[PDB]
From a paper:
PCC7120. Taken together, these results suggested that the COG4337 proteins are metal-free enzymes that catalyze the hydration of CO2 to HCO3-, but not the reverse reaction. Each domain formed a cone-shaped barrel structure comprising three α-helices and a four-stranded antiparallel β-sheet, which were almost identical across the COG4337 domains of Bn86287 and [name]. We thus concluded that COG4337 proteins should be treated as a new variant of ι-class CAs.
To further analyze the metal-free catalytic mechanism of COG4337 proteins, crystal structures of Bn86287 and [name] were determined. The substrate (bicarbonate) and inhibitor (iodide ion) were found in a bent finger-like cavity of the cone-shaped barrel. Notably, Lys180 in [name] was found at the analogous position of Tyr224/388/552 in Bn86287. To evaluate the functional importance of the cavity-forming residues, we performed point mutation analysis, wherein Thr106, Tyr124, Lys180, His197, and Ser199 were substituted by alanine in [name], and Thr486, Tyr503, Tyr552, His584, and Ser586 were replaced by alanine using a recombinant protein of the third COG4337 domain (431–607 amino acids) in Bn86287. The deprotonation process could also be assisted by the main chain nitrogen of Thr106/159/322/486 and the hydroxyl group of Ser199/258/422/586 that is positioned within hydrogen bond distance to Thr106/159/322/486. The results of size exclusion chromatography with multi-angle static light scattering (SEC-MALS) system showed that Bn86287 exists as dimers but [name] exists as tetramers in solution.
Residue numbers in the entry:
A (entry chain B), D (entry chain B): 43 to 205
B (entry chain A), C (entry chain A): 42 to 205
Write the structure that this text describes.
Amino acid sequence: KTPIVNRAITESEVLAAQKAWGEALVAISTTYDAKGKASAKALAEKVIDDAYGYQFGPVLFKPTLAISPRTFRTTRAGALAYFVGDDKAFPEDKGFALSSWRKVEIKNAAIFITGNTATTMGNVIITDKQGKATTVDKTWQFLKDDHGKLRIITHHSSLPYEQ
Amino acid sequence: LKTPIVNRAITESEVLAAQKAWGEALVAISTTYDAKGKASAKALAEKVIDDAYGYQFGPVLFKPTLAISPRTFRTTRAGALAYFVGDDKAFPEDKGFALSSWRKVEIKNAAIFITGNTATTMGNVIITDKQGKATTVDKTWQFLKDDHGKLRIITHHSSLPYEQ
Amino acid sequence: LKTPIVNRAITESEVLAAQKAWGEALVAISTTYDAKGKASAKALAEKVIDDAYGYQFGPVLFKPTLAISPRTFRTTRAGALAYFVGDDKAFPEDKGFALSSWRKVEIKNAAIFITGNTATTMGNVIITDKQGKATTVDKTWQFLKDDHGKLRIITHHSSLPYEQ
Amino acid sequence: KTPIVNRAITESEVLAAQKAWGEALVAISTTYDAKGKASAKALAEKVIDDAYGYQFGPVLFKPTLAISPRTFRTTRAGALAYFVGDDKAFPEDKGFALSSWRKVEIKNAAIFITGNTATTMGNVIITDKQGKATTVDKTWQFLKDDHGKLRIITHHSSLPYEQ
C-alpha cells in the first residue's frame, strides 16, 4: 500500500475527541469523589495538557461560569483553576469538575472541518450522580498536531439564554 | 520583478479588518433602519450576511447572544437574517437585534489563533446605541479566506457574560 | 438525522479520483485529436485545463516534462494549453504533448501527503500510445480542494527519469 | 498587545527556509573538504533531521540524480545516502553534497502559500569552488510544524530538459 501522511481531520476523530473530553471531565469528578482534591487536580493537569493546546500558546477558552475580570482562560493555569479551583489567582473558581459528574452527552448542531482543524457547535449535556443535568451551548475547535492528536484550541461555553 | 505568489493564508491585518468590517456593517444596518425603515434595513442585512458570513459553504456555526432553545443555532441564512432584523414567523422570538439604533462597535480581542487558511478570535465586543447604552458580549469568530481572498465568518459564538 | 457538516479536507479517495480524472482527460484530448482534429482537441483541452488546474487562483506551479529553459515554468493558462496542444507562437517549441495518440494512463504513487486542505502526490505516471509505446515520468502533483469541493492542480512537476 | 498563535507561513519564512537549505548544503560540502566524510555525514544527519520532515512519515523527495529502482527517497536514509553516499543500500549514490559547493542561488518562478504549508517552484543554481554552476528545476513544499519551523515535505528536483 502507498505510504501516506494525513494531517487532515475526519468526522470520526472529531467525535472521538469530543467524547474523550467528556471521559476526561467525568474522570476528574470521579477521582475527586473517591480520592479527594489532590489526586483530581493531578488528574486534571494531565488532562489539560493532553486535551488542550496550551503548548502552542493561548487557548481561546471562555468557560461557562468565568467572571468578568478573568473571563478568558488563555493560560494552562486558567483552565486548571476553572476545572478544580485551588488557585488564589482565581478566587471565584470553586472547580467546575468537582460536581460529581457521571455522564456527558454531545449534541452537535454543525461541524466544520477546515483542513487540519475542525470546529463543532452544539449542545453538551452533563449529568451528575443524582441525575441533575446541566446544558451548555458549546463551540470546540480541534487542531491535529504533528503527532496526529486533536487538541482544543478554542472552547467557548455558555449558559443557554432564557427569557 | 516580483515573484508571482498565491497567498491563501490569513494575516493579523486581514483578521482585524474583518472584525472591523462586521461592526461597520452592524451600525450600517441599524443606521439604515432609523433613517430608511425596515425594508431598506432588511435589504442591507441580506447583502451583509451574504458578504461577511459563509453560508455559501454550508452551515455557519452561528449561536447568537439571545437565541432561544428550539432555535439556538442559526445554521441557515434565514436564521441569521431573522436574528438581525426579525420579521420571520419561522423565528417568532426574533425582534431584530440590529434594529436597536446602534452607533459604535468596539473589539477587544483576548486571543487570536491563525490556523493558516482560517483564523479564530475570542474576546469582547462592545456595541453602543444612539443614546449611549453599551452592551458587552463574549464573542468567538472564525474567519475563512475564500478562493477570492475574502474572509468569511464560518463560526460565531456570542454569549452574555456570566454574572452572580 | 445527520449532523450538517462542511468538509474542506481532502481524502485519499478524493486524491486518487483526481489523478485518475487527469489521465482520463489526457486520453480524451489525444483521442479527440485522432478522431476530430486539432480544433476539437484544443477546445477540449481548454475545458480540461480550466476544470483540473487552478489558474483561477493565480499562477499554477506547472513545470512540464519537456519544456525548455526560457519557458520552463508554465504559470499561465496559455502556457499549459500550449504545452498540451501546441499551436501558440508564444511557445514556439510546443508541438502538442497531448496529440501523441495516447490511450492508457497508469498512476503509481510512491507517497501521498494530505496537508488538510491540500494534498501532494509523488510517484510515476506511465502513458502509452495507440501503438503500445509507453513513456514513464516522475511526477509531483498538488491538489487544492476549492470552495466548491473540486480538487484542482496548483502544482505539477514532471521530469524525465534520470539515466546514465 | 493581543496574544496570537500563527500557524500560517509568510513569504519571508519561505525565502528564509529556502536559503537555509543552501546554507545546509554548502556546510556539508565545506565540511567534507576540510574534515572528511565522517564529520560531513554527521553534519548532514543533523541537517536532514532539521530541514526535512521525515519525522511525520514519508517525505516526497525525488532527487535530481536518483536512478529508477530508488528514485524516491521517502526515508531519512534515502536522503542521507543521496547527499553523502556511504550506504550500501544505495550503491549508485556517491554523495551529491560532496562536490565542494560554495554558493547557492534560488530563482523562484512561483510561490503558493496554502495555509500552513507553502510551495515554491523555480530554479536553483549551485556553484562549486572552481565556479562550475549546476542548474536544477526545483519544487519545494514546506510545512510549518507545531514549533513554528518549516520542514521539507516535498522535494522534486530535475535536470533542465534540453533538445
